[PDB]
């Protein structure tokens, strides 16, 4: 199959408690991105998820980081090589 | 009333779920820890906390952080000035 990480980002974003998404590489490159997530915020993520992996040995045991506000909660994942982020509103 | 942080660590170490806590100021200045949370621990811990913090715009709004994997959960926020991380297993 062809599947692109624009459509996926479109079909995250279906999820009507899912108000933005942002992918990076290990080094902060925005891959791509919608909604409350956006350029400003691909670096810090990246930071999030690079600080969070060195709290940990494997194997492959890479800790899920949440962070949660009154503006609501993002959770950062790493999913086949790329750093995921999702926020939610609450 | 006199209190100091090396009688909060002991107070908080009594929980049986947690298993590590540690502070730090916002530099990364290990102020005091216990258990599965120590010396080379506490850059990490404020960096997470310093990064989380500039996804958002106050008043006050300091996200908390969480970090989940096999080994346990993180909880990293700040009270009266200075970064609070709590290390409990699952």
Do not use: W
């Amino acid at each position: 199959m062809e599947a692109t990480l624009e459509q996926h980002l479109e079909d995250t974003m279906k999820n009507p408690s899912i108000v933005g998404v942002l992918c990076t590489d290990s080094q902060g490159l925005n891959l791509g991105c919608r909604g409350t997530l956006s350029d400003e915020h691909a670096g810090v993520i990246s930071v999030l998820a690079q600080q969070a992996a060195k709290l940990t040995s494997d194997p492959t045991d890479i800790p899920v980081v949440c962070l949660e506000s009154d503006n609501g909660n993002i959770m950062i994942q790493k999913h086949d090589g790329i750093t995921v982020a999702v926020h939610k509103m609450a």
